[PDB]
Enzyme design. Structure first.
Site, PDB file in Angstrom:
ATOM      1  N   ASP B  42       0.848  -1.185   0.000  1.00  0.00           N
ATOM      2  CA  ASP B  42       0.000   0.000   0.000  1.00  0.00           C
ATOM      3  C   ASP B  42       0.888   1.241   0.000  1.00  0.00           C
ATOM      4  O   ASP B  42       2.109   1.162  -0.179  1.00  0.00           O
ATOM      5  CB  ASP B  42      -0.974  -0.023   1.186  1.00  0.00           C
ATOM      6  CG  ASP B  42      -0.267  -0.057   2.520  1.00  0.00           C
ATOM      7  OD1 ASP B  42       0.790  -0.710   2.613  1.00  0.00           O
ATOM      8  OD2 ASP B  42      -0.769   0.569   3.476  1.00  0.00           O
TER       9      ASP B  42
HETATM   10  P1  LIG Z   1      -2.374   4.272   0.975  1.00  0.00           P
HETATM   11  O1  LIG Z   1      -2.498   4.649  -0.481  1.00  0.00           O
HETATM   12  O2  LIG Z   1      -2.609   2.813   1.241  1.00  0.00           O
HETATM   13  O3  LIG Z   1      -3.563   5.022   1.741  1.00  0.00           O
HETATM   14  C1  LIG Z   1      -3.363   5.435   3.121  1.00  0.00           C
HETATM   15  C2  LIG Z   1      -4.169   6.695   3.404  1.00  0.00           C
HETATM   16  C3  LIG Z   1      -3.685   7.334   4.705  1.00  0.00           C
HETATM   17  C4  LIG Z   1      -3.944   7.681   2.268  1.00  0.00           C
HETATM   18  C5  LIG Z   1      -5.665   6.398   3.488  1.00  0.00           C
HETATM   19  O4  LIG Z   1      -6.091   5.934   2.227  1.00  0.00           O
HETATM   20  C6  LIG Z   1      -6.618   7.479   3.977  1.00  0.00           C
HETATM   21  O5  LIG Z   1      -6.705   8.539   3.365  1.00  0.00           O
HETATM   22  N1  LIG Z   1      -7.327   7.219   5.065  1.00  0.00           N
HETATM   23  C7  LIG Z   1      -8.279   8.141   5.664  1.00  0.00           C
HETATM   24  C8  LIG Z   1      -7.668   9.470   5.983  1.00  0.00           C
HETATM   25  C9  LIG Z   1      -6.797   9.366   7.208  1.00  0.00           C
HETATM   26  O6  LIG Z   1      -6.305   8.305   7.513  1.00  0.00           O
HETATM   27  N2  LIG Z   1      -6.592  10.463   7.930  1.00  0.00           N
HETATM   28  C10 LIG Z   1      -5.781  10.503   9.130  1.00  0.00           C
HETATM   29  C11 LIG Z   1      -4.349  10.185   8.841  1.00  0.00           C
HETATM   30  S1  LIG Z   1      -3.162  11.437   9.376  1.00  0.00           S
HETATM   31  C12 LIG Z   1      -2.883  10.869  10.998  1.00  0.00           C
HETATM   32  O7  LIG Z   1      -3.643  10.136  11.568  1.00  0.00           O
HETATM   33  C13 LIG Z   1      -1.548  11.212  11.536  1.00  0.00           C
HETATM   34  C14 LIG Z   1      -1.580  11.156  13.005  1.00  0.00           C
HETATM   35  C15 LIG Z   1      -0.327  10.539  13.578  1.00  0.00           C
HETATM   36  C16 LIG Z   1       0.948  11.132  13.090  1.00  0.00           C
HETATM   37  C17 LIG Z   1       1.159  12.521  13.584  1.00  0.00           C
HETATM   38  C18 LIG Z   1       2.522  13.054  13.292  1.00  0.00           C
HETATM   39  C19 LIG Z   1       3.135  13.806  14.420  1.00  0.00           C
HETATM   40  C20 LIG Z   1       4.507  13.354  14.761  1.00  0.00           C
HETATM   41  C21 LIG Z   1       5.547  14.350  14.390  1.00  0.00           C
HETATM   42  C22 LIG Z   1       6.890  14.001  14.895  1.00  0.00           C
HETATM   43  C23 LIG Z   1       7.963  14.801  14.269  1.00  0.00           C
HETATM   44  C24 LIG Z   1       9.170  14.745  15.127  1.00  0.00           C
HETATM   45  C25 LIG Z   1       9.220  13.423  15.839  1.00  0.00           C
END
Ligand SMILES: *P(=O)(O)OCC(C)(C)[C@H](O)C(=O)NCCC(=O)NCCSC(=O)CCCCCCCCCCCCC
Ligand SMILES: CCCCCCCCCCCCCCCCCC(=O)OC[C@H](COP(=O)([O-])OCC(O)COP(=O)([O-])OC[C@@H](COC(=O)CCCCCCCCCCCCCCCCC)OC(=O)CCCCCCCCCCCCCCCCC)OC(=O)CCCCCCCCCCCCCCCCC
Ligand SMILES: CCCCCCCCCCCCCCCCCC(=O)OC[C@H](COP(=O)([O-])OCC(O)COP(=O)([O-])OC[C@@H](COC(=O)CCCCCCCCCCCCCCCCC)OC(=O)CCCCCCCCCCCCCCCCC)OC(=O)CCCCCCCCCCCCCCCCC
Ligand SMILES: CCCCCCCCCCCCCCCCCC(=O)OC[C@H](COP(=O)([O-])OCC[N+](C)(C)C)OC(=O)CCCCCCCCCCCCCCCCC
Ligand SMILES: CCCCCCCC/C=C\CCCCCCCC(=O)OC[C@H](COP(=O)(O)OCCN)OC(=O)CCCCCCC/C=C/CCCCCCCC
Ligand SMILES: CCCCCCCC/C=C\CCCCCCCC(=O)OC[C@H](COP(=O)(O)OCCN)OC(=O)CCCCCCC/C=C\CCCCCCCC
Ligand SMILES: CCCCCCCC/C=C\CCCCCCCC(=O)O[C@H](COC(=O)CCCCCCC/C=C/CCCCCCCC)COP(=O)(O)OCCN
Ligand SMILES: CCCCCCCCCCCCCCCCCC(=O)OC[C@H](COP(=O)(O)OCCN)OC(=O)CCCCCCCCCCCCCCCCC
Lengths: 55, 87, 63, 67, 128, 178, 459, 52, 125, 174
Positions: B42
């Site tokens: 994926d």
């Molecule tokens: P791939 O093509 O298989 O598809 C995966 C995705 C994610 C594109 C899905 O198809 C999708 O769009 N799903 C629904 C949307 C979604 O998942 N939204 C939420 C995702 S963002 C998220 O949850 C991030 C939160 C955790 C990470 C936060 C980052 C912070 C940390 C920063 C640290 C930097 C210094 C350490």
């Protein structure tokens, strides 16, 4: 990909020449110059080794 | 100073990294193995593969171009084109 | 051979030219070359006039 | 000298560089030990530091309070 | 949860923290498509001229010409002596002059008074 | 740099770019490989936990909160590859890149010093000059009446043709020109 | 001085009777010969000037300027060769005639012994410059530039003529020797204030002074290369020479009337350097740098101390040479790309190495790198200003910092960076251009070797 | 805050200096009167140092 | 560095000495017979040796001897250890004399404070 | 060479201590001095001998121009251009000579400071007083006359100073 190679004679010789001068140069220089200042002969023991302690 | 890269060496190194990946079966892996169509990965796995290639070859692939490299052959072609490898 | 031909020109010619320039042109004018006078210590021999600079007093022993 | 690059392996070293590095580290430590044996005063002091509390009023010229 | 980032003039807000980057309307997509179309048209024109084999010279840039003309030769015709312009011009063109005049006049008057009173160290000053 | 940009970045592209940035900054924080692997596995666990979400509004809100968290927790001095923009070796060899139009201003003696190269250069110049009309015709045939809507160029449809606007892309200076 | 004057009046018929393809060769060769002849004027005395006759005399201030003019003529001829390839024979001969007449008028102006003849020739220099600008300029603004230049100069100089005739009627003679020996103090009254204003304002408009300087960018940007070379190097020094000559009869009133002009000149140094920081045109940058240097010379002349006149003369000569070299380099870059925008062409160090070296040397001389005569003059002026007051040091320091900033900024913008991709007409530098730059730069270093020749009569 | 704190602490350390429990350094011949450029014609005020 | 700084800055600065103003009491105050310090090296000898003005203290003769030793045995710079030690010991004695002066000033100041407090008590009652 | 006047350019006698080594090690400075004498000093001496022999083949002389004394601006009548010109030229020559005198004194001071070295504050105090006197006199004479200085301006300054001195003396002893 490990490309580490420091066997060049130029590098080795230059670092070696600057390396002998990092051990045996302060002694020679300080023993071959006239005294331009009055030394601090008397001082407390904890002040004589202050630099070593903080280091 | 450093030895120049070649197409065979680039292909060997990228296949080495892909075979070291634990989510890819080495026996069914080839240079035309699509990561998602016939390898069952994926988007996150593809991003991790691209990052592994970046770490392996010591340079960064922009996200605009990284999202399109879906084959080991495509990765080889991109690396060779960027590094000016013609043999 | 290379070090010999490098040492004659690059070292021997500039030193000759500079010594000739200093000894006969720079020192031909007053105060151009001024040397800090040598340090004279007690119990010494002034070579110019054949003089003897005497010793100091008798040091009181400090142990 | 020619050094072949290594892939995912420890690089090829040389006896000359190994012995030279060991020799210079040994030289540094020998110099430190030899200097400390002869010139320990430069690090540990040479003359004792006097204690002002042990000085007598007679030798400091301090008269009794009654005067 | 976390401290917020406060943008400034020289510390502008990042594109990932812009609130408008997450509230997208269908009109915004149309505007973005129009911008991309304009950029693509300009890029196509430039690339045609740039890859023309018979071209020998400099591809004149109308944007660069407009910028240079506006910054130099278009200022005065579009100037009106508003109170803001009048005050800013008077200040920035006169105030420094009188400030420096006062400073130098005070310094020179003090020096001249000291010289007249004969209490200024002028010894060894034989080069003026 | 080789791909024409789109009008906008989709939600998948936004979250993938955020994931890559977070992994790179986490690697910058976690210097050692085992620690980096542990925390990268935790980060991908978070992303996979939020992976399945039918509500696009909630997904966008999660993305916004994640971006705020990344900006707060980013490395002040992140690792940058030497040749990447901002790297210590970025644009280092731009002063050594000289073009072929400079190359054709040479003196006849200099050109005679390299006889075999300039024959092939003349062949390349003839090949360029014999294709420009076909390239421009193909470009003007395939464009919409309004004009280009993207910076993507068509390939060569015919066997004897070349992809339009290829000269500078093909003859760009090498990455280590000297 | 006839041994120098007559060969120019022979350059004229030689130019008009030479063959169509030999005009440049003949003019250049004989201009170089005349410069060599004029080199003999550097043998000045220590007490009084060289009084050849009742009409012409040479001084330690006049001699370097005459040598500079006679040396500058052939360089202008080379630049004219550069930019006048397709002109007709008669128009080329007319251009050479204008240059020759301008040089002759400048020589007679510098060697004139009376103030009225000096004024006549110093105003006679306007006609050839105006004709050159408004006839062989390349852009539309040349007519406006000529109008601004002519009317600024005349509005400055007419009260000078009135003051000169009044002074002659009052005292008896305008001969410089007589007005120096028979000089009397000027009382502090309104009439004396206005006479001082007439003379000084004339020479300050010519200088130019900050606030009276827009004609300088207007004329220098729109003039051809030879016109820009003569405007910046020599024609700007007429005001300085006049002030160093006319201030003999203006004391002690100069001690009281110098404050507004000193403040204007120092704040003008600051303002023009700041303007140079943000200029999109290279010629405008060079023109404003010239304005700043001339403001520094104004400060030196107004403070009027023996250490300030030597610095003034050295700075005038050095600035003339440096500005001429900078204008030549900018003209070469313009003729390559047909545009004066600075950020249009980049990577010129990659494309043209020797021109990059010339740019580096010219920019180093512009920012007064020691031991160049630029720095010698600037340092003498700074020391004299410090003796005058102790905040002039602050002003000079900030001016020097901004000068270095904009010099290196223009160097980095033009020469360093990535070359413009779509500019593919950058041909290799010509031997003519390289020789022009070398002939500009070598005399600067030779005068650095021998600096006592350009330190004026107070050395 | 950093620069202001450093300046304030430098001023505090200036008005509360650090030294050693010793007396002033003693020099011979009226604290080297002639060696520092004193006028030979004039007679300086005597400076006498005693043992302790 | 030391406890004297703490005593002066967080205690009775009147009882603690002032380094920039001491000595305050007369040198003969409390000393019935005090001997003036003796200088061995003369002004002319120090001038000829070209000692720095900070080096022309009462320990200058040992410095002159050290300089003469060092100049004579030039190639063997590891020679004048005895002269160096003699100079260092003379400087040490000078420093301990300075410390004695400081301590004398301190306890004289505290004795003056005690005397004036006793006088105040007597005046009060 | 010593083709200059020792009285005009004084130099104290040079006292060089005799070498009295206390060690058996050889002197590298002495060996290098011998090498320098063998390799440099002798060839340059031979070259100079040849050059001076060639110079003595044809010996010619040049003279120091003597300028007569002329009446000065005090004796010159007002608006008498010839006498004023002569007086101005004489005054300018005197001004240059005084500048060179000040230069000579400054050279003396610099040389004395460098020679004395570490004990200059006391040893070279005689040159400092001479330089102070010469500098004060030069400043009083050619003080701030400006860039257009002249014999008339110097005379006016001297008259003003004389009037001030006379007034001060009168108000003191009156
Ligand atoms: P791939 O093509 O298989 O598809 C995966 C995705 C994610 C594109 C899905 O198809 C999708 O769009 N799903 C629904 C949307 C979604 O998942 N939204 C939420 C995702 S963002 C998220 O949850 C991030 C939160 C955790 C990470 C936060 C980052 C912070 C940390 C920063 C640290 C930097 C210094 C350490
Ligand atoms: C207007 C504001 C103003 O006065 O600004 C002063 C300020 C100068 O600072 P300053 O030293 O404080 O002013 C003089 C002192 O106050 C007082 O100075 P002072 O006491 O030493 O006496 C000197 C004073 C003696 O006073 C007089 O002479 C008073 C009578 C003046 C008669 C009219 C003169 C006409 C010609 C002027 C130039 C025209 C061009 O001299 C002048 O007044 C000379 C005036 C002209 C100066 C030069 C201007 C050049 C052009 C400037 C840019 C123009 C755009 O700016 C100007 O003079 C230029 C103003 C431009 C608008
Ligand atoms: C005189 C030199 C005038 C400029 C060079 C003109 C010729 C030229 O293009 O040379 C490059 C070129 C190098 O060969 P290339 O690799 O083919 O050229 C490619 C690049 O152009 C090669 O260019 P590049 O970048 O590799 O280097 C060219 C070089 C060329 O640039 C320069 O030479 C610039 C020098 C001036 C800097 C700006 C003015 C500052 C004031 C200095 C005043 C000093 C006057 C001294 C007396 C001079 C008398 C002439 O530029 C530099 O080295 C960079 C600037 C270095 C500045 C150093 C520090 C300057 C301030 C301190 C100086 C202190 C001196 C007195 C000390 C007193 C106390 C002991 O030279 C030659 O080919 C020379 C052959 C012909 C020479 C003339 C005939 C000689 C025989 C008679
Ligand atoms: C007398 C004969 C001795 C045996 C033969 C020696 C070699 C043959 C040549 C004669 C040499 C004579 C002695 C010279 C000094 C030898 C070393 C020595 O004594 O060291 C003492 C000292 C070492 O003594 P030390 O202080 O370490 O000794 C300590 C002794 N203990 C521990 C027992 C207390 O070393 C030096 O002084 C260093 C010398 C550095 C020299 C650097 C190179 C100079 C190169 C010059 C090039 C240019 C030459 C021409 C110049 C003129 C222009 C053309
Ligand atoms: C009073 C006693 C002390 C006095 C001060 C002593 C300073 C000693 C400094 C070093 C001693 C002099 C060594 C001379 C070296 C120069 C000789 C030379 O020119 O080259 C010979 C030879 C080969 O040179 P290449 O570059 O390889 O050329 C190959 C040609 N095919 O030079 C060498 O490499 C000799 C190896 C040097 C050993 C390392 C010495 C390290 C010295 C450290 C202290 C030196 C500090 C410098 C001065 C100290 C005082 C300020
Ligand atoms: C500018 C605006 C102001 C100037 C307007 C010019 C109109 C004249 C106004 C000033 C006239 C001054 C004047 O006439 O007297 C000066 C005096 C008259 O005295 P007498 O009567 O002969 O004898 C003493 C009587 N007890 O005559 C002189 O000193 C000769 C010189 C006077 C010339 C007039 C001065 C002109 C003013 C100069 C300013 C120059 C400005 C430059 C413009 C630059 C523009 C870019
Ligand atoms: C008490 C401590 C002061 C510290 C000073 C700090 C700097 C502040 C002073 C300069 C700031 C600018 C003030 C002057 C600029 C005029 C402001 C302005 O442009 O206002 C106009 C309208 O004009 C006015 O409002 C005038 C109000 C201020 C007038 C001040 C008194 C006028 C002074 C007369 C003297 C002028 C000549 C001064 C120099 C003479 C020589 C010294 C319209 O403003 P907008 O930009 O369109 O709207 C923005 C709203 N925030
Ligand atoms: C962390 C810092 C903790 C301590 C902060 C203390 C702030 C106040 C302070 O430093 O007070 C000390 C006070 C300053 O007074 P001061 O300005 O010296 O007055 C003399 C008048 N010209 O000092 C005094 O009033 C007397 C100082 C005596 C010591 C002087 C030594 C020289």
């Amino acid at each position: 990909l490990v490309l580490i190679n420091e066997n060049n004679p130029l590098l080795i010789n230059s670092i070696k020449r600057l390396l002998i001068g990092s051990i045996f140069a302060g002694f020679i220089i300080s023993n071959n110059i006239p005294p331009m200042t009055v030394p601090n002969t008397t001082m407390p023991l904890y002040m004589k080794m202050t630099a070593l302690i903080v280091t | 100073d450093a030895p120049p890269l070649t197409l065979e060496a680039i292909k060997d190194r990228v296949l080495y990294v892909l075979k070291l990946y634990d989510k890819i079966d080495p026996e069914k892996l080839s240079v035309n193995s699509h990561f998602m169509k016939d390898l069952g990965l994926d988007s996150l796995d593809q991003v991790e593969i691209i990052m592994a290639m970046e770490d392996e070859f010591g340079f960064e692939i922009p996200d605009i171009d990284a999202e399109k490299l879906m084959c080991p052959q495509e990765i080889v072609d991109y690396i060779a084109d960027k590094k000016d490898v013609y043999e | 051979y290379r070090h010999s031909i490098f040492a004659v020109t690059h070292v021997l010619i500039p030193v000759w030219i500079i010594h000739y320039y200093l000894k006969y042109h720079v020192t031909a004018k007053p105060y151009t070359v001024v040397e800090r006078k040598p340090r004279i210590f007690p119990g010494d021999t002034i070579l110019e006039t054949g003089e003897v600079i005497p010793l100091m007093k008798e040091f009181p022993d400090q142990h | 000298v020619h050094i072949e690059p290594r892939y995912r392996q420890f690089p090829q070293l040389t006896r000359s560089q190994l012995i030279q590095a060991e020799f210079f580290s040994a030289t540094m430590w020998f110099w430190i030990l030899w200097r400390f044996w002869h010139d320990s005063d430069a690090v540990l002091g040479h003359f004792p530091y006097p204690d002002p509390s042990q000085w007598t009023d007679e030798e400091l010229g301090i008269l009794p309070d009654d005067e | 949860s976390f401290p917020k980032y406060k943008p400034s003039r020289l510390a502008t807000l990042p594109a990932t923290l812009d609130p408008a980057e997450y509230d997208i309307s269908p009109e915004t997509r149309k505007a973005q498509a129009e911008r991309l179309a304009i950029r693509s048209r300009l890029k196509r024109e430039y690339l045609l001229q740039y890859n023309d084999p018979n071209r020998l010279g400099v591809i004149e840039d109308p944007a660069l010409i407009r910028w240079t003309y506006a910054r130099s030769a278009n200022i005065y015709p579009n100037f009106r002596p508003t109170p803001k312009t009048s005050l800013l011009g008077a200040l920035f063109g006169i105030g420094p002059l009188f400030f420096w005049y006062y400073v130098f006049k005070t310094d020179r008057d003090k020096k001249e008074k000291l010289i007249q009173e004969g209490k200024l160290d002028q010894t060894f000053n034989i080069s003026y | 740099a080789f791909s024409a940009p789109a009008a906008y970045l989709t939600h998948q592209q936004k979250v993938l770019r955020l994931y890559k940035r977070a992994l790179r900054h986490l690697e910058s924080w976690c210097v050692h490989r085992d620690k980096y692997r542990y925390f990268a596995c935790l980060m991908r666990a978070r992303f996979d936990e939020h992976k399945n979400e039918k509500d696009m509004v909630k997904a966008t809100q999660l993305l916004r909160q994640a971006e705020e968290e990344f900006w707060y927790g980013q490395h002040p001095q992140p690792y940058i590859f030497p040749e990447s923009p901002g790297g210590t070796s970025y644009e280092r060899y731009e002063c050594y890149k000289v073009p072929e139009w400079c190359l054709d201003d040479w003196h006849p003696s200099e050109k005679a010093m390299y006889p075999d190269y300039f024959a092939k250069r003349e062949q390349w110049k003839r090949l360029r000059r014999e294709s420009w009309e076909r390239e421009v015709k193909q470009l003007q045939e395939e464009t919409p009446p309004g004009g280009p809507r993207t910076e993507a160029l068509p390939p060569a449809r015919k066997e004897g043709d070349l992809p339009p606007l290829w000269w500078h892309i093909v003859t760009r200076p090498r990455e280590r020109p000297m | 001085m006839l041994k120098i004057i007559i060969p120019t009046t022979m350059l004229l018929p030689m130019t008009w009777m030479s063959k169509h393809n030999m005009i440049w060769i003949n003019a250049t060769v004989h201009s170089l010969l005349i410069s060599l002849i004029s080199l003999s004027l550097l043998n000045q005395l220590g007490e009084n000037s060289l009084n050849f006759s009742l009409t012409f005399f040479s001084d330690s201030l006049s001699a370097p300027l005459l040598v500079l003019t006679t040396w500058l003529l052939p360089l202008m001829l080379m630049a004219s060769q550069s930019h006048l390839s397709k002109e007709t024979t008669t128009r080329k001969k007319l251009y050479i005639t204008m240059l020759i007449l301008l040089q002759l008028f400048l020589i007679m102006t510098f060697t004139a012994t009376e103030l009225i003849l000096f004024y006549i020739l110093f105003e006679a220099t306007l006609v050839p410059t105006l004709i050159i600008i408004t006839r062989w300029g390349n852009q539309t603004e040349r007519l406006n530039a000529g109008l601004y230049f002519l009317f600024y100069t005349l509005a400055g100089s007419l009260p000078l003529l009135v003051a000169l005739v009044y002074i002659q009627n009052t005292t008896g003679s305008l001969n410089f020797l007589i007005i120096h020996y028979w000089s009397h103090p000027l009382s502090n009254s309104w009439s004396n204030i206005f006479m001082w204003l007439a003379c000084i304002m004339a020479f300050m408009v010519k200088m130019p002074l900050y606030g009276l300087h827009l004609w300088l960018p207007k004329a220098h940007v729109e003039a051809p290369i030879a016109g820009s070379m003569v405007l910046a190097a020599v024609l700007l020094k007429l005001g300085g020479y006049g002030m160093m000559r006319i201030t003999t009869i203006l004391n002690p009133l100069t001690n009281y009337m110098a404050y507004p002009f000193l403040m204007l000149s120092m704040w003008g140094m600051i303002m023009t350097s700041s303007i140079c920081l943000r200029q999109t045109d290279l010629k405008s940058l060079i023109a404003y740098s010239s304005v700043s240097h001339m403001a520094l010379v104004i400060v030196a002349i107004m403070i009027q101390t023996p250490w300030s006149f030597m610095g003034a003369t050295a700075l005038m000569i050095a600035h003339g040479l440096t500005s001429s070299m900078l204008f030549c380099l900018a003209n070469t870059n313009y003729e390559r790309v047909h545009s004066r925008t600075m950020i249009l062409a980049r990577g010129l160090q990659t494309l043209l190495p020797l021109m990059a070296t010339w740019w580096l040397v010219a920019s180093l001389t512009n920012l007064a790198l020691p031991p160049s005569i630029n720095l010698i003059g600037e340092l003498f002026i700074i020391t004299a200003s410090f003796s005058w007051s102790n905040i002039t040091i602050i002003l000079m320091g900030m001016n020097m910092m901004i000068t270095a900033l904009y010099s290196l900024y223009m160097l980095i913008t033009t020469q360093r960076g990535k070359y413009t991709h779509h500019i593919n007409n950058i041909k290799p530098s010509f031997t003519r251009e390289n020789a022009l730059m070398a002939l500009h730069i070598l005399p600067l270093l030779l005068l650095t070797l021998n600096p006592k020749m350009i330190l004026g009569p107070l050395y | 805050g950093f620069v202001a704190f450093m300046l304030f602490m430098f001023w505090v350390g200036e008005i509360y200096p650090s030294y050693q429990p010793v007396g002033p350094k003693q020099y011979p011949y009226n604290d080297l009167y002639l060696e520092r450029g004193g006028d030979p014609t004039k007679e300086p005020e005597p400076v006498v140092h005693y043992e302790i | 560095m030391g406890a004297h700084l703490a005593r002066r800055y967080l205690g009775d600065a009147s009882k603690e000495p002032d380094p920039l103003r001491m000595p305050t009491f007369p040198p003969d105050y409390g000393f019935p017979e005090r001997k003036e310090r003796e200088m061995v090296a003369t002004q002319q000898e120090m001038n000829d040796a070209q000692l720095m003005l900070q080096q022309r203290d009462y320990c200058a003769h040992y410095l002159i001897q050290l300089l003469k030793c060092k100049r004579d045995s030039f190639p063997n710079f590891l020679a004048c250890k005895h002269e160096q030690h003699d100079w260092d010991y003379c400087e040490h004695l000078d420093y301990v004399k300075r410390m004695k002066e400081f301590e004398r000033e301190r306890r004289l100041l505290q004795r003056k404070k005690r005397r004036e407090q006793r006088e105040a008590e007597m005046a009060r009652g | 060479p010593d083709s200059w006047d020792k009285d005009v350019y004084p130099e104290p006698p040079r006292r060089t201590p005799a070498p009295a080594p206390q060690t058996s090690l050889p002197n590298p400075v002495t060996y290098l001095t011998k090498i320098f004498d063998l390799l440099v000093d002798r060839p340059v001496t031979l070259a100079r001998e040849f050059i001076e022999q060639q110079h003595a083949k044809n010996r010619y002389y040049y003279y120091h121009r003597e300028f007569r004394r002329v009446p000065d601006i005090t004796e010159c009548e007002e608006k008498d251009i010839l006498c004023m010109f002569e007086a101005e030229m004489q005054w300018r020559r005197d001004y240059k000579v005084d500048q060179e005198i000040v230069n000579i004194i400054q050279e003396r001071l610099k040389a004395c400071q460098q020679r004395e070295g570490e004990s200059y504050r006391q040893n070279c105090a005689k040159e400092l007083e001479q330089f102070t006197q010469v500098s004060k006199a030069f400043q009083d004479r050619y003080s701030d006359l400006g860039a257009h200085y002249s014999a008339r301006k110097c005379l006016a300054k001297q008259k003003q100073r004389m009037l001030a001195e006379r007034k001060a003396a009168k108000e003191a002893a009156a």
